[PDB]
Design a protein around this ligand. Structure first.
Ligand SMILES: CCCCCCCCCCCCCCCCCC(=O)OC[C@H](COP(=O)([O-])OCC[N+](C)(C)C)OC(=O)CCCCCCCCCCCCCCCCC
Ligand SMILES: CCCCCCCCCCCCCCCCCC(=O)OC[C@H](COP(=O)(O)OCCN)OC(=O)CCCCCCCCCCCCCCCCC
Ligand SMILES: CCCCCCCCCCCCCCCCCC(=O)OC[C@H](COP(=O)(O)OCCN)OC(=O)CCCCCCCCCCCCCCCCC
Ligand SMILES: CCCCCCCCCCCCCCCCCC(=O)OC[C@H](COP(=O)(O)OCCN)OC(=O)CCCCCCCCCCCCCCCCC
Ligand SMILES: CCCCCCCCCCCCCCCCCC(=O)OC[C@H](COP(=O)(O)OCCN)OC(=O)CCCCCCCCCCCCCCCCC
Ligand SMILES: CCCCCCCCCCCCO[C@@H]1O[C@H](CO)[C@@H](O[C@H]2O[C@H](CO)[C@@H](O)[C@H](O)[C@H]2O)[C@H](O)[C@H]1O
Ligand SMILES: N=C(N)NC(=N)NCCc1ccc(I)c(Cl)c1
Ligand code: SF4
Ligand code: SF4
Ligand code: SF4
Lengths: 95, 313, 69, 176, 93, 386, 154
């Protein structure tokens, strides 16, 4: 139980402080830390954690601006470009 | 200072009711292998606020009641009586220390059904009145066992004062000597508050074809009654030791027991199918009532034959 | 995970903690730091009335001891 | 071969009778059900964080349609009208004529996306892999008219999604 | 004085919340059985009025008399239930 | 008096809307008059304007919980009029996905049966399993539900590499999931109070009213079309037919739960006995050739062109072909006039006769027992109304 | 005045879109994928979209399946009994424009002939994720509303 609490605190640091921790919590409603698989030209960031169960082992943190639109709060699934769309939906294994 | 005392009872009740809707949705979500609200506010903490505002700015049904005088009276009676049941609760000190507190709550709870009836008449529909008579017939039936079970427990307490239940359980919870009564008491409250598996008004309404702000007020009244039943159940059967110097120690332990009992209605709703209307009537008139009458006989005799008669004071 | 249900339970728990704690605190404030006197029967009311006279300020919860003998 | 699902005779020895009486009076079989829902409360939920997480799909997934090109940029479609012929919903409307260079190409290629059943028969019938159902499924609109695709819309879908469509075709064409 | 003020506050707030929420003769075919449920409730409720004094009745010197009359009343309650039961007053078919 | 049951529950439900006109006396049901047609879409007339391939997707949308089983029935009827035979690997795939589909249907049948009665938690546990089986549908066909995968001649495509291992992984853990479902319902006194001795139907009445499937086997009738009149490779797999003894809702509920266990038993054999080879009849006048052949061979291209425009012609004749669908006997009376479009296509939906028996089965029951009785028949108004 | 109205719309738009209680017409196939959106993988309840509601407590009607001429009057009546604000989501080809039964004598060629539609969700059936995308698209549509700004400028 002590190690469970430690993992919780490592997520705050894993998100570059409390401000970046609260940022993803209110943007994505999730504070998991993953491995940055890559980033596309629009600013979307792609993460993986194969320790998670299938369907949660890959995710994207959407960019805050895309094509002159403010997407800090307004994100949607159509913002993923086709090259990453294949990876995010597990149609392929290779990013 | 007494007005202030009234407010720090009323307002915390309505906030507790608002967030019970969140807790119910999330406890049921996880028992169903999902999450429940977790987007509107961190961990869904703003979901009750979003629902409250949504319901109040929602256009009313424009129903055209048959009695405007009594269309409005029903929700006022439901919510006014629900708040009234809290004033004699010793937590550990009651807002009003009533010598006959148990009778007061038994008497006030007997008036709850008037709101069910008055809404049926105000419905202006044959089917809504029939539904109101089935809810009333179920509620009053399960009031019979609650009154007798309550009396049987008071024969070991010796008073109608709710604080005496705390003294009665200084050395031991009443659940030990009276666990058979505790079981039927708990199920009677589920049936009394029309909760699953006894949620027949919600179910039979979902069948018959024909049968927002006012909905919200009715909802809060029902959920404030659920919390109060479980607080009363903890006081009645799981009495918390009271330290006069550290009174908030009693409140913490008492609150945890109430939450666990309230969370158990949620647990039960997640676990069982729904009774059929005649089947929950057979449950009371042919199972609980014969056993409650026999245990009422037992609990009158038991203190006498053991020389364990409690004092009046 | 299941522990994400606790924040909702904590808020509802604090909401149910305020009434019992508020009544106890206000009683101590209103009764000079003591429990509010309980008078259910005529005897207890008689002594509360007598204490009100004895105190000399019309306050039953002001207690007079051996210093008035 | 058969088996009986409910052909058991209860044992009437006093012990077994008392076992059933305890179940009735003490609700033991109801307590057991409460254990099962309790065990789920402490299990990890199956929910995924949409839209940040997505449901897994395969290269065969039949989503939004697109018209494809050769690597040169020439359109693959030659207005053969096999897709229009096979479409179970009559959702495709095609017209064609000789292009200014004499090429056999369409002047109209419409797909009523509110008639379509997303069955993929058109992409099976196409002899040149011109029409495909792409991987996009997040294209709901606010008006009916936006779901009546013409050739410009479908060609733009091909240019938009070709990077992923080509990869999906590469991963599945040996099963076709 | 305190109880009335508590009662006034509860119902005054209920009216206040209600007004915000709202603005800012023949024979019903309902069965005989449901009538006899209400009448059964009343008669049982009346016999429950008589049992309420029992927690005070147990302090009496005349315990033999009290206990006999306490069980006598509850047994008549049982016999009343037994009679409706055997006269098919509890059946819903 | 006179009531009308609502179109559907307040919670989300997928089986169609019913207009049930009820006669009651007190709590008792005196008459049930089902008014259907609220989902009648003229499927059978539409099929007459389609080629035999174009009509196949109409069958996914009948009992739209048992998609591939409906496809198999239509494919068997067409293959019988064509006088051809699908290849053995296709037959094994069709039985494999027939049993996967039976799991899909029985989960929907049993957990929505509990959900309507108010036992709602098992619904959520078991549609996570249905979600994983939707992934199997989408991996072979690209569609989660309406696959159009089984076709006259075999199956459209071969299993993707790695699919069978995943099906094995799912089947490994599934029996425990059925066990948890039974923990909530089987011995629950409330569930039994809602189901035992409800909607009793005698063996003779069941036959004369045209029942099939579990509606027959719940009354002790020893009939299963997979045993008596086997199709595809069902005569090469071992399984037991569950038989009820009391003919009521509870016995039919147990039959469906046991049928789920037998489906897992059959799936285990299909995974181990899957043979190699082609997936559609090697006969390019019925089944389209491979895309590589279509782009290299003159004969292949011609046959591709004709199969996808005119379609294949079916010799004139009429067949009634039926299978053991998850909901009972699902059949098609298919009439060919020698052309490439069916002349007539009557669909025998097992729920059509079952809902016609609701009035009989509900006599002398309570208003809430009608909920359980429509539940135990497992009605999808897509197949009832066509 | 101008500032308050802007922040006030922000509040009520937040409340209405964060608490979307749906009435689903499970007419046909598409209701199955609708159930899968309520199932644990997507858990529509976590967005505030409750499981069960009742027509007279609902904010959004989801027409999930084929609408026949026989069913058309009953669907319109439910829409007419919904308290406002009310939205309609057309789910799948049948409800969108008739779909695979478009040319049938007994099918309404699109539910938008009977009720006004806010969102059209394509597919036959749309995947549960596609429907969830459409529901979150409707939330964005509500987030764009400006009832008080328009009212204040009348
Ligand atoms: C009386 C108390 C009412 C408090 C207002 C509650 C508003 C909460 C809120 O806006 O959450 C932040 C929200 C959260 O943003 P969101 O709801 O648009 O989206 C969050 C990100 N997703 C959807 C991807 C999960 O911020 C806003 O969107 C601005 C709304 C302002 C409304 C407040 C008016 C005052
Ligand atoms: C149609 C719409 C109607 C809506 C209106 C609201 C509905 C009615 C609300 C419920 C009314 C409850 C009134 C009865 C409660 C009285 C409780 C009581 O017994 O007194 C408590 C308290 C002192 O403690 P006590 O219990 O009297 O000690 C007894 C010693 N053996 O205090 C007292 O004893 C003194 C209190 C006496 C004055 C109470 C007058 C009540 C009038 C109600 C109208
Ligand atoms: C079988 C399924 C059940 C379904 C119904 C739900 C029943 C739920 C029961 C809820 C109550 C559980 C008990 C909660 C314990 C609370 C922990 C606590 O803070 O208090 C500690 C308490 C011991 O202290 P105390 O209660 O004061 O005992 C002295 C005697 N007067 O207690 C020590 O442990
Ligand atoms: C340690 C000392 C003792 C040790 C030895 C044990 C002795 C005590 C045990 C033996 C006492 C006799 C027990 C007999 C009880 C069973 C009687 C019976 O067979 O009738 C039950 C049955 C009820 O069936 P039901 O479906 O509910 O409705 C009618 C359709 N059958 O058919 C009926 O219609 C029953 C109708 C009569 C209902 C009786 C109601 C009981 C009275 C209610 C109060 C309970 C008792 C007092 C309190
Ligand atoms: C030394 C001498 C001493 C003398 C005294 C000795 C006493 C001996 C007697 C001991 C046993 C008494 C048991 C009393 C408990 C009540 C029993 C009961 O009423 O259960 C029977 C009831 C009927 O069920 P059924 O299957 O239909 O039986 C056929 C009836 N014709 O079944 C039901 O109630 C069904 C209830 C369904 C709903 C339950 C759902 C919740 C279950 C978990 C709740 C756990 C309770 C938690 C308690 C919390 C308390 C704070
Ligand atoms: C928890 C307290 C929160 C208090 C917040 C106070 C903010 C007050 C702003 C109220 C804005 C209400 O906005 C408005 O509400 C009513 C019903 O509620 C809706 O309904 C109304 O409009 C429609 C057409 O527009 C009418 O046909 C209908 O008769 C009418 O009821 C409106 O469509 C909506 O635009
Ligand atoms: N979906 C349901 N109808 N049930 C439910 N959980 N309703 C909760 C809705 C509600 C009602 C009043 C208030 I005040 C608040 Cl805060 C929330
Ligand atoms: S997917 Fe099927 S229905 Fe849609 S356009 Fe292609 S052939 Fe026609
Ligand atoms: S898309 Fe393909 S099948 Fe359709 S007309 Fe063009 S080349 Fe022919
Ligand atoms: S759109 Fe497709 S899945 Fe939905 S009801 Fe129509 S045929 Fe069925």
């Amino acid at each position: 139980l002590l190690q469970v609490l430690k993992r919780g605190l490592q997520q705050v640091s894993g998100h570059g402080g409390l401000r970046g921790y609260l940022r993803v919590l209110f943007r994505a409603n999730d504070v998991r830390v993953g491995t940055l698989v890559g980033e596309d030209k629009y600013g979307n960031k792609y993460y993986e954690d194969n320790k998670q169960f299938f369907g949660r082992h890959r995710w994207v943190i959407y960019t805050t601006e895309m094509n002159g639109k403010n997407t800090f709060w307004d994100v949607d699934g159509s913002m993923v470009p086709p090259e990453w769309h294949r990876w995010l939906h597990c149609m392929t294994d290779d990013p | 200072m007494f007005m202030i005392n009234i407010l720090m009872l009323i307002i915390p009740i309505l906030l507790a009711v608002a967030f019970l809707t969140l807790v119910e949705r999330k406890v049921l979500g996880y028992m169903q292998l999902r999450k429940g609200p977790n987007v509107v506010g961190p961990y869904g903490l703003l979901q009750p606020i979003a629902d409250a505002i949504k319901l109040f700015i929602k256009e009313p049904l424009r129903p055209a009641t048959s009695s405007a005088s009594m269309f409005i009276l029903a929700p006022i009676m439901a919510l006014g009586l629900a708040l009234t049941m809290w004033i004699p609760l010793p937590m550990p000190y009651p807002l009003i220390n009533m010598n006959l507190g148990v009778l007061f709550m038994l008497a006030m709870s007997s008036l709850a059904v008037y709101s069910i009836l008055w809404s049926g008449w105000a419905s202006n529909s044959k089917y809504a009145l029939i539904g109101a008579l089935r809810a009333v017939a179920q509620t009053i039936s399960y009031e019979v066992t609650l009154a007798i079970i309550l009396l049987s427990v008071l024969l070991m307490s010796g008073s109608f004062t709710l604080s005496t239940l705390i003294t009665t359980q200084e050395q031991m919870w009443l659940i030990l000597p009276a666990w058979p009564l505790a079981m039927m008491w708990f199920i009677s409250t589920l049936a009394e508050t029309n909760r699953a598996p006894f949620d027949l008004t919600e179910g039979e309404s979902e069948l018959v074809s024909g049968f927002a702000g006012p909905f919200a007020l009715f909802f809060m009244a029902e959920y404030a009654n659920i919390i109060m039943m479980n607080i009363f159940t903890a006081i009645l059967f799981l009495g918390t030791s009271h330290n006069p110097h550290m009174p908030e120690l009693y409140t913490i332990n008492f609150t945890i027991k109430s939450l666990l009992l309230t969370m158990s209605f949620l647990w039960i709703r997640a676990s069982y199918p729904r009774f059929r209307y005649d089947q929950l009537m057979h449950l009371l008139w042919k199972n609980f009532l014969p056993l409650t009458l026999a245990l009422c006989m037992w609990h009158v005799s038991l203190p006498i034959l053991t020389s364990g008669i409690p004092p009046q004071t | 995970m299941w522990f994400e249900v606790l924040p909702g339970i904590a808020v509802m728990g604090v909401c149910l903690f305020i009434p019992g704690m508020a009544t106890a605190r206000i009683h101590r404030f209103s009764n000079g730091g003591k429990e509010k006197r309980v008078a259910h029967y005529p005897y207890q009311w008689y002594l509360m009335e007598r204490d009100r006279r004895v105190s000399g300020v019309n306050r039953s919860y002001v207690s007079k001891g051996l210093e008035n003998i | 071969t058969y088996k009986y699902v409910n052909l058991r005779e209860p044992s009437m020895d006093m012990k077994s009778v008392t076992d059933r009486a305890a179940q009735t009076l003490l609700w033991t079989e109801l307590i057991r059900g409460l254990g099962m829902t309790l065990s789920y409360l402490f299990r990890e939920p199956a929910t995924i964080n949409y839209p940040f997480e997505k449901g897994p799909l395969s290269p065969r997934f039949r989503g939004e349609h697109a018209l494809r090109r050769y690597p040169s940029g020439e359109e693959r479609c030659i207005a053969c009208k096999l897709c229009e012929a096979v479409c179970p919903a009559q959702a495709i409307t095609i017209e064609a004529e000789p292009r200014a260079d004499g090429s056999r190409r369409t002047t109209r290629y419409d797909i009523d996306m509110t008639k379509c059943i997303y069955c993929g028969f058109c992409q099976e019938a196409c002899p040149v892999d011109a029409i495909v159902e792409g991987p996009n499924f997040e294209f709901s609109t606010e008006t009916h008219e936006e779901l009546l695709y013409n050739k410009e819309k479908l060609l733009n879908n091909g240019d938009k999604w070709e990077a992923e469509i080509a990869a999906n075709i590469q991963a599945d064409y040996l099963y076709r | 004085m305190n109880l009335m003020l508590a009662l006034l506050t509860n119902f005054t707030l209920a009216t206040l919340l209600v007004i915000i929420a709202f603005w800012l003769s023949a024979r019903l075919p309902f069965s005989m059985k449901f009538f006899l449920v209400a009448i059964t409730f009343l008669l049982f409720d009346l016999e429950i009025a008589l049992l309420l004094p029992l927690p005070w009745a147990s302090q009496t010197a005349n315990l033999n008399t009290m206990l006999t009359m306490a069980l006598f009343l509850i047994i008549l309650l049982a016999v009343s239930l037994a009679y409706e039961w055997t006269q098919k007053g509890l059946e819903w078919t | 008096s006179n009531l009308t049951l609502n179109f559907g529950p307040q919670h989300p439900a997928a089986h169609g809307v019913l207009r049930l006109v009820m006669e009651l006396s007190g709590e008792m049901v005196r008459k049930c008059d089902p008014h259907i047609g609220l989902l009648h879409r003229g499927t059978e007339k539409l099929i007459e304007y389609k080629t035999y391939l174009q009509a196949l997707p109409y069958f996914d949308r009948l009992d739209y919980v048992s998609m591939m089983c409906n496809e198999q029935a239509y494919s068997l009827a067409v293959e019988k009029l064509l006088n051809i035979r699908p290849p053995p690997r296709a037959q094994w795939i069709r039985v494999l996905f027939g049993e996967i589909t039976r799991l899909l249907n029985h989960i929907m049948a049993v957990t929505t049966h509990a959900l309507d009665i108010g036992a709602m938690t098992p619904f959520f546990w078991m549609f996570e399993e249905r979600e994983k089986m939707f992934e199997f549908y989408e991996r072979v066909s690209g569609a989660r539900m309406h696959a159009a995968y089984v076709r006259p001649g075999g199956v459209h495509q071969d299993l993707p590499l790695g699919l069978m291992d995943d099906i094995y992984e799912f089947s490994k853990n599934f029996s425990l999931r059925i066990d948890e479902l039974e923990e909530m319902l089987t011995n629950n006194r409330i569930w039994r109070n809602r189901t035992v001795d409800i909607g009793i139907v005698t063996a003779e009445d069941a036959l004369n009213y045209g029942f099939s499937g579990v509606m027959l086997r719940g009354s002790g009738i020893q009939w299963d079309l997979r045993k008596t009149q086997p199709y595809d490779v069902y005569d090469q797999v071992e399984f037991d037919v569950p038989i009820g003894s009391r003919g009521d809702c509870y016995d039919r509920y147990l039959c469906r739960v046991e049928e789920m266990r037998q489906s897992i038993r059959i799936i285990s054999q299909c995974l181990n006995k899957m043979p190699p080879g082609e997936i559609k009849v090697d006969d390019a006048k019925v089944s389209p050739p491979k895309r590589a052949e279509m782009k290299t061979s003159m004969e292949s291209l011609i046959h591709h062109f004709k199969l996808y425009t005119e379609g294949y012609q079916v010799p004139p004749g009429a067949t009634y072909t039926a299978i053991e669908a998850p909901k009972g006997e699902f059949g098609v009376y298919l009439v060919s006039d020698g052309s490439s479009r069916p002349y007539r296509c009557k669909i025998k939906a097992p729920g059509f006769a079952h809902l016609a028996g609701l009035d009989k089965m509900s006599k002398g029951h309570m208003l809430a027992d009608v909920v359980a009785i429509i539940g135990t028949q497992d009605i999808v108004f897509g197949e009832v109304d066509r | 005045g101008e500032y308050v109205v802007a922040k006030l719309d922000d509040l009520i738009n937040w409340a209405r879109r964060s608490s979307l209680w749906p009435m689903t017409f499970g007419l046909a196939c598409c209701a199955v994928e609708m159930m899968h959106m309520a199932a644990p993988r997507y858990d529509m309840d976590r967005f505030g979209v409750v499981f069960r509601a009742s027509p007279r407590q609902s904010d959004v009607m989801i027409v999930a399946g084929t609408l026949t001429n026989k069913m058309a009057p009953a669907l319109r009546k439910v829409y007419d009994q919904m308290p406002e604000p009310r939205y309609v989501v057309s789910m799948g080809s049948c409800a969108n424009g008739g779909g695979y039964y478009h040319y049938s004598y007994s099918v309404v060629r699109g539910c938008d002939r009977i009720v006004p539609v806010d969102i059209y969700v394509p597919g036959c059936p749309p995947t549960a994720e596609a429907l969830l995308y459409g529901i979150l698209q409707l939330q964005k549509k509500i987030k764009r509303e400006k009832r008080l700004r328009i009212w204040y400028r009348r």
